[PDB]
Symmetry: C6
Subunit: 68 residues, 6 copies
């Protein structure tokens, strides 16, 4: 397929679906997808919005499926 | 050879073959290949469809060979 | 979205917000974002300014959110 | 040198030389090189043909040298 | 910012400042920056000059800050 | 600097200098640099010539410095 990663993150962002982001070092982050660009995902939890590099993400697991 | 990765994922997707996706952090994911694009594989199990970055995949092991 | 990583690092740099930079090897660095370019972030603490490769950064966690 | 990786994998493929493929997570795969493209190696053992991403391969060790 | 990584390594090289280079596998190298190019840093210690791939470097920590 | 990685590997290859190649998974390989291309280094020891992906190499340590 073509051009699927952005619709997936946009659906999560617009529907406010909580996610778990598993990083290549074994860190698991949880929060809301606030925004993203070519390189990063901005992930907000109750404390702060942090900047996650896509190159370090292995998988993004939503709390429920988003229908693209 | 040339242009083999997409036929392999497409065969898995169309034939509904279960896979194991081994990630660079040692996580093993199991499910169905729902879709893919240049950067990601959408992997569905009984809970959710998650977005897996190809850069984090080491190997994809089908439950049976697909014949391309 | 588009062109978000540079506004985020610039806000941190200009507002002097302390950060934690988590690296893919499990090192956590703390300090101030002094500068950055296409490839690196220069991170200053009380000892020195060190050069961090973006490819090795998983997430940058500010002490407080920056509003872009 | 120039253009050596494809002759090496092609020699292994055509001569049916068993290989060990060491991945960046510490997995060692064994089998035959069935095919490859810009991004992947298809590796067959007695069970299945699996798709290995080149980005995850550290070294490919043949059972004997191939003479290119 | 723009074009900062080369001035940083050049300052270290010209001023003979000792560095610690932390690699993604957890190796820490120490020595002098002898030279660098698009892909590598040549790092000299009392034994030898070794070739370090930038893709494997997480952070370069000078013994003192260099002023660019 | 510019265009240093190839002169370094070529000097090792032509002078038959033994090397240690440290990989991102912690494997250390030893042998002779037989050849290289844009993506790989062919490393020969007494058993076989193996194909090492540059993306997986952290540092190459010669038994003695090569003078470029």
């Amino acid at each position: 397929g073509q051009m699927l990663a952005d619709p997936f993150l946009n659906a999560l962002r617009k529907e406010h679906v909580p996610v778990s982001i598993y990083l290549v070092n074994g860190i698991k982050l949880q929060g809301q997808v606030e925004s993203f660009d070519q390189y990063v995902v901005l992930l907000r939890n109750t404390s702060v919005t942090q900047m996650v590099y896509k190159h370090a993400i292995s998988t993004i697991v939503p709390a429920r499926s988003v229908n693209l």
